[PDB]
Design a protein around this nucleic acid. Structure first.
Ligand SMILES: [K+]
Ligand SMILES: [K+]
Ligand SMILES: [K+]
Ligand SMILES: [K+]
Ligand SMILES: [Mg+2]
Ligand SMILES: [Mg+2]
Ligand SMILES: [Mg+2]
Ligand SMILES: [Mg+2]
Ligand SMILES: [Mg+2]
Ligand SMILES: [Mg+2]
Ligand SMILES: [Mg+2]
Length: 148
RNA sequence: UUGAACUCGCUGUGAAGAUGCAGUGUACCCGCGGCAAGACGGAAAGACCCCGUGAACCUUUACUAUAGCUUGACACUGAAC
């Protein structure tokens, strides 16, 4: 299937590229996510005539993501409280939803889909390092302090 | 049940076990109560047996198929290393 990329897609190409991808790749991911469109004559001519504003919007999105990442980094450390045993091990667990809620209460709005926990979901009291992905290329870090 | 009967015995003859043929013996016409030796008695187009290039249902390492079960290829089906 021939498609026109509407953004930067890793291992595929840059915006405006015309690429041949597997039909399922286009059908179930790229088009529904908005990262590409079918390479019909209408689409090709329309995009080529109306192209540059899209890079302007992509730059605006990247700048907004950078600003949000800077705010997240400036937030530094966020503290979450739960219940645990005397050994410091939590009976329950601390996940993306409540981490994002704590960050939002701290001031920066982050969705649960932007939380990236490398070593699974937190289960012990102490300090952990969590990552945030607000853009496909930028990354932020937050210290999480779990207390009883 | 019943082709029609003026519907005896014997010995023979004879699709080869005769009331009905031949020879011969016996016998006046007709009921009623009884008995079942014969009318190859009545009943059911022999069930045994064979035959038909008949039937059915059953069996199986008979033949040919086939549901099911199982194998792989392609499709729905994508990304990275
Ligand atoms: K005579
Ligand atoms: K009799
Ligand atoms: K035969
Ligand atoms: K039968
Ligand atoms: Mg004789
Ligand atoms: Mg005689
Ligand atoms: Mg009498
Ligand atoms: Mg009697
Ligand atoms: Mg008889
Ligand atoms: Mg017969
Ligand atoms: Mg047969």
């Amino acid at each position: 299937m021939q498609v026109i990329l509407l953004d930067k897609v890793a291992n595929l190409g840059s915006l405006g590229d015309q690429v041949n991808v597997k039909a399922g790749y286009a059908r179930n991911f790229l088009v529904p996510q908005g990262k590409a469109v079918p390479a019909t004559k209408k689409n090709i001519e329309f995009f080529e005539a109306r192209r540059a504003e899209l890079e302007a919007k992509l730059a605006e999105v990247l700048a907004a993501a950078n600003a949000r990442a800077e705010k997240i980094n400036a937030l530094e450390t966020v503290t979450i409280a739960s219940k645990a045993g005397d050994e410091g091990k939590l009976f329950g667990s601390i996940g993306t939803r409540d981490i994002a809620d704590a960050v939002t209460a701290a001031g920066v709005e982050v969705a649960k889909s932007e939380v990236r926990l490398p070593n699974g979901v937190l289960r012990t009291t102490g300090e952990h390092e969590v990552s945030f992905q607000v853009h496909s290329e930028v990354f932020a870090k937050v210290i999480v302090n779990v207390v009883a």
